[PDB]
Design a protein around this ligand. Structure first.
Ligand SMILES: Nc1nc2ccc(I)cc2s1
Length: 118
């Protein structure tokens, strides 16, 4: 009975602090693990700038904006899209960041999102 969307506040991490630099070894695994870490409260977000992606591990999981009107309760509506070797699995809007495991690193901010659970 999972609701279609969940309001989450994600810790924003600096890339050089991240200890576990991705979720796994295949597109299906990284999407699965991302969704589990989101449910457990153990997922962080790295904002993408020059130099960030080469310091993280593929496949990547991005959170991308899913619409233009829903910022319900101050949370941007987003969905997950994976990337491996330049091919994306999903099509969505602008990237808010790359998701990574959170294992206790100190964040620099929080990003409020309304996440589509599949
Ligand atoms: N299918 C499911 N994916 C997710 C993603 C985030 C959260 I919180 C719960 C679930 S259950």
């Amino acid at each position: 009975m999972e609701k279609t969307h969940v309001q989450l506040s994600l810790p924003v991490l600096q890339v050089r602090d991240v200890l576990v630099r991705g979720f796994g070894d295949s597109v299906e695994e990284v999407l699965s693990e991302a969704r589990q870490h989101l449910k457990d409260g153990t997922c962080g977000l790295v904002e993408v700038e020059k130099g960030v992606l080469p310091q993280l591990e593929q496949p990547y999981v991005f959170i991308k904006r899913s619409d233009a009107r829903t910022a319900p309760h101050g949370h941007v509506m987003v969905e997950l899209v994976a990337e491996l070797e330049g091919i994306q699995y999903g099509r969505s809007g602008e990237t808010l960041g790359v998701l990574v495991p959170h294992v206790g690193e100190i964040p620099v901010a929080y990003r409020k999102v309304l996440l589509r659970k599949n």
